[PDB]
Amino acid sequence: KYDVVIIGSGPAGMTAAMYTARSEMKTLLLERGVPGGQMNNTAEIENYPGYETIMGPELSMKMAEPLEGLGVENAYGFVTGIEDHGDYKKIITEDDEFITKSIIIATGANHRKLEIPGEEEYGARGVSYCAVCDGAFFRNQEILVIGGGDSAVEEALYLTRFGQSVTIMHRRDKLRAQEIIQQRAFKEEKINFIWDSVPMEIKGDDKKIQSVVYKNVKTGEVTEKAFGGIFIYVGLDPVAEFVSDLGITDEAGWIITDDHMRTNIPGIFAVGDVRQKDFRQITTAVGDGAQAAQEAYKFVVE
Amino acid sequence: KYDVVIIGSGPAGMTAAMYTARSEMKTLLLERGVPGGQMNNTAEIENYPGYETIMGPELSMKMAEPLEGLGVENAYGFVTGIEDHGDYKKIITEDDEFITKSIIIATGANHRKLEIPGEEEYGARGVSYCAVCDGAFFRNQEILVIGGGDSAVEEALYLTRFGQSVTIMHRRDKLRAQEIIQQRAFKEEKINFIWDSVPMEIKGDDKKIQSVVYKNVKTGEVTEKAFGGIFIYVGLDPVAEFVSDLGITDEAGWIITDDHMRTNIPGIFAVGDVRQKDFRQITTAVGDGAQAAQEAYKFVVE
Numbered sequence: 318k319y320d321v322v323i324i325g326s327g328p329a330g331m332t333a334a335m336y337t338a339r340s341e342m343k344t345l346l347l348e349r350g351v352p353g354g355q356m357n358n359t360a361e362i363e364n365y366p367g368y369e370t371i372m373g374p375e376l377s378m379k380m381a382e383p384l385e386g387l388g389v390e391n392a393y394g395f396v397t398g399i400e401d402h403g404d405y406k407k408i409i410t411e412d413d414e415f416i417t418k419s420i421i422i423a424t425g426a427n428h429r430k431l432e433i434p435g436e437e438e439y440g441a442r443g444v445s446y447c448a449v450c451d452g453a454f455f456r457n458q459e460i461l462v463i464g465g466g467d468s469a470v471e472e473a474l475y476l477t478r479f480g481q482s483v484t485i486m487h488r489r490d491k492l493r494a495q496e497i498i499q500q501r502a503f504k505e506e507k508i509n510f511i512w513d514s515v516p517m518e519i520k521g522d523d524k525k526i527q528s529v530v531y532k533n534v535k536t537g538e539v540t541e542k543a544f545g546g547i548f549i550y551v552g553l554d555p556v557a558e559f560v561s562d563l564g565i566t567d568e569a570g571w572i573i574t575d576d577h578m579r580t581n582i583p584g585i586f587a588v589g590d591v592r593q594k595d596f597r598q599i600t601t602a603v604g605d606g607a608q609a610a611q612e613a614y615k616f617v618v619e
Numbered sequence: 620k621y622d623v624v625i626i627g628s629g630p631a632g633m634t635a636a637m638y639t640a641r642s643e644m645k646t647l648l649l650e651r652g653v654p655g656g657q658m659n660n661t662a663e664i665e666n667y668p669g670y671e672t673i674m675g676p677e678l679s680m681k682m683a684e685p686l687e688g689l690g691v692e693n694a695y696g697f698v699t700g701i702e703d704h705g706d707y708k709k710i711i712t713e714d715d716e717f718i719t720k721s722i723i724i725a726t727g728a729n730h731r732k733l734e735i736p737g738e739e740e741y742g743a744r745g746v747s748y749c750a751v752c753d754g755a756f757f758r759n760q761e762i763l764v765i766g767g768g769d770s771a772v773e774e775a776l777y778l779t780r781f782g783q784s785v786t787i788m789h790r791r792d793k794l795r796a797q798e799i800i801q802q803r804a805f806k807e808e809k810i811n812f813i814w815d816s817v818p819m820e821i822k823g824d825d826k827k828i829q830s831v832v833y834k835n836v837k838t839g840e841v842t843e844k845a846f847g848g849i850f851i852y853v854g855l856d857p858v859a860e861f862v863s864d865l866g867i868t869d870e871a872g873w874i875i876t877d878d879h880m881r882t883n884i885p886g887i888f889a890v891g892d893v894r895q896k897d898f899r900q901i902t903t904a905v906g907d908g909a910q911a912a913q914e915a916y917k918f919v920v921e
């Protein structure tokens with residue numbers, strides 16, 4: 318049936334579908350939630366070339382709008398599995414099955430949340446999950462980072478280029494980050510640490526964050542401190558449950574591809590945040606989605 | 620002096636500069652011409668996610684406009700050389716020199732022109748140099764492709780998915796393209812050939828192309844035929860004369876990088892159309908630029 322099925326309608330998948338459909342490939346775009354993916358949980362985006370500033374859901378609409386006129390068949394699907402039959406592959410959703418010559422997996426990643434009062438309320442008003450994205454908004458402020466792995470500590474060091482101070486709050490008494498990243502953190506004076514502690518409530522006014530209430534997990538001692546921003550790194554997971562058995566993922570479950578977005582399965586490509594890679598952004602998601610589209614064309618051709 | 624100098628203000632270099640500046644790297648963007656690069660010679664762009672349609676020069680302006688407010692220093696420079704000195708590199712322009720810790724080369728490519736009457740007049744009114752970019756505009760039309768290499772013939776093949784027919788006109792009596800590509804052309808019935816011929820004039824009305832006059836280079840014999848669009852592939856060159864002696868280029872002079880945009884010289888990255896790669900688009904230029912900015916940041920930190 319399909320020349321190509323794209324799983325996931327975030328920026329990578331919409332870019333790939335735009336391409337494949339424009340190139341007259343019979344194109345299906347599957348989505349279990351809402352077009353735009355993680356962009357839908359974003360306020361101001363200032364690093365997508367072409368818009369000085371644009372809101373996440375605005376950009377989601379902009380990217381989705383042309384797809385139907387270009388021929389993309391949009392369809393609801395919560396993809397649970399994929400079978401390769403050589404000449405074709407089968408995609409299994411909760412109520413359906415699709416046959417296709419090629420597959421572009423574009424199902425993204427999930428940023429684990431704190432799930433404390435205030436987190437949602439102040440999302441893009443002080444709460445963030447990405448320093449490259451948002452760090453710039455907090456020049457000379459007191460910045461709080463939550464987490465103790467490579468990500469928390471690396472983004473903390475990055476954020477010391479903006480904040481007056483960066484504080485790392487971790488639930489244990491030492492860090493899980495690599496030694497070299499740790500060494501950098503201990504040498505940087507603008508960083509300090511709050512150990513054995515977890516946040517309880519993110520507080521502020523109607524407009525922006527003003528403080529964080531936190532608790533020492535060993536002692537029970539509760540404390541409130543002023544902070545102007547909170548960056549959260551309590552885990553980042555691939556969203557690729559439906560490929561777990563296919564042999565195309567790494568330890569943590571990221572999809573391995575070559576520079577051409579090809580997985581080790583012929584006709585199966587992956588793009589965007591779901592890939593094993595080190596820079597997760599709209600721009601790199603778009604770049605990936607265009608590349609995979611060209612490769613899927615080529616594959617379907619030969 | 621600088622943390623990073625981006626050479627070239629096309630989409631790849633503008634995205635890179637935007638990223639480095641936002642990350643507080645002391646950032647210079649050098650450009651000999653007009654910001655936007657090849658986007659300035661483009662009419663409608665329909666495959667840059669975020670815009671259903673936008674004019675090349677309009678996109679250029681949207682991408683250039685934020686750069687100064689983010690801290691990019693724009694400066695005029697026709698770059699002629701680069702010296703690596705280990706800790707720093709020197710960039711030589713016709714009338715100046717700059718010192719920098721790192722360099723992102725973003726100098727693009729040049730599509731060679733026919734230089735015949737009508738080529739400019741019907742640029743984006745039937746004259747094109749990129750089938751993935753423009754083919755969609757010629758469904759069911761008589762399409763003419765100029766050139767005899769891998770690019771002409773692969774784009775011709777691609778274009779048969781829109782046009783009623785596709786004629787390849789080559790100046791010699793047989794093709795330079797790979798045998799496999801040639802076999803595919805020969806087997807595709809919507810392709811035919813005009814040999815030992817070159818175009819002389821592209822003609823039409825005030826809006827669009829209606830015909831092409833051409834000449835048999837052996838016989839002198841002239842012909843006019845009706846065509847609705849013309850796609851030109853008489854050569855594509857890197858624009859990177861200022862690196863020719865640095866050991867970072869391939870046979871044809873494309874800059875070789877890894878998947879992180881790294882050249883074999885530390886602190887020297889390259890992005891976008893100038894790179895050796897297979898898919899030249901704004902999307903992939905933007906993806907490249909973002910990635911290199913993040914690599915430059917990392918290079919400059921350690």
Ligand SMILES: Cc1cc2nc3c(=O)[nH]c(=O)nc-3n(C[C@H](O)[C@H](O)[C@H](O)COP(=O)(O)OP(=O)(O)OC[C@H]3O[C@@H](n4cnc5c(N)ncnc54)[C@H](O)[C@@H]3O)c2cc1C
Pocket residue numbers: 324325326327328329330347348349350351352353354355356358359360361362363364365394395396397423424425426428445446447450451556557559588589590591597598599600602
């Ligand atoms: C709060 C926040 C702010 C951000 N700000 C910025 C910024 O300012 N600039 C920037 O460049 N980047 C930003 N990012 C990063 C950017 O949003 C991501 O890099 C980008 O969205 C990745 O796109 P994607 O297409 O790979 O995946 P995603 O956008 O995650 O979308 C994947 C899609 O796949 C769908 N899907 C998943 N599994 C299935 C399944 N089994 N079946 C069907 N559908 C499925 C999901 O619902 C989803 O819609 C931000 C991220 C967050 C969380």
Ligand SMILES: Cc1cc2nc3c(=O)[nH]c(=O)nc-3n(C[C@H](O)[C@H](O)[C@H](O)COP(=O)(O)OP(=O)(O)OC[C@H]3O[C@@H](n4cnc5c(N)ncnc54)[C@H](O)[C@@H]3O)c2cc1C
Pocket residue numbers: 626627628629630631632633649650651652653654655656657658660661662663664665666667696697698699725726727728730748749752753858861890891892893899900901902904
């Ligand atoms: C007619 C046409 C139509 C196109 N249509 C589309 C489309 O619809 N969609 C799409 O995705 N892509 C399209 N493309 C391709 C797209 O324009 C390119 O992929 C993109 O512009 C390349 O980005 P870049 O930043 O790598 O280089 P470029 O855009 O080439 O920019 C390089 C810049 O570097 C500057 N420079 C070069 N040398 C030096 C030097 N020595 N010193 C200082 N500055 C220097 C140049 O002045 C130039 O401004 C089109 C291209 C053309 C020619």
